[PDB]
């Protein structure tokens, strides 16, 4: 890879899917927090910093965060 990137440093279609994916996948208690933190921030959530970021800034349990992170990655 010689030139710039597209996905960089975030690209619309990326967390458009991501939050798609996300209330297409996961549910109850679990897309409401993806897709929260994904609305409240772009910035955070496709390359979002490391499970423990988002789940201190949603102020929920890493676990949840990393099964619907896993879930909505798993497409990839």
Same mark, same amino acid.
């Given at each position: %890879?010689?030139?710039?990137?597209?996905?960089?440093?975030?690209?619309?279609?990326?967390?458009?899917?991501?939050?798609?994916?996300? %209330?297409?996948? @996961?549910?109850?208690?679990?897309?409401?927090?993806?897709?929260?933190? @994904?609305?409240?921030?772009?910035?955070?959530?496709?390359? =979002?910093? =490391?499970?423990?970021?988002? =789940?201190?800034?949603?102020?929920? =349990?890493?676990?949840?965060?990393?099964?619907?992170?896993?879930?909505?990655?798993?497409?990839?």
């Amino acid at each position: %890879k010689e030139t710039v990137p597209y996905q960089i440093p975030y690209t619309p279609s990326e967390l458009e899917e991501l939050q798609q994916n996300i %209330k297409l996948e @996961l549910e109850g208690k679990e897309q409401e927090l993806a897709l929260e933190l @994904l609305n409240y921030l772009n910035e955070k959530g496709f390359l =979002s910093k =490391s499970v423990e970021e988002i =789940s201190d800034v949603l102020r929920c =349990s890493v676990e949840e965060l990393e099964k619907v992170r896993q879930k909505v990655l798993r497409l990839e």
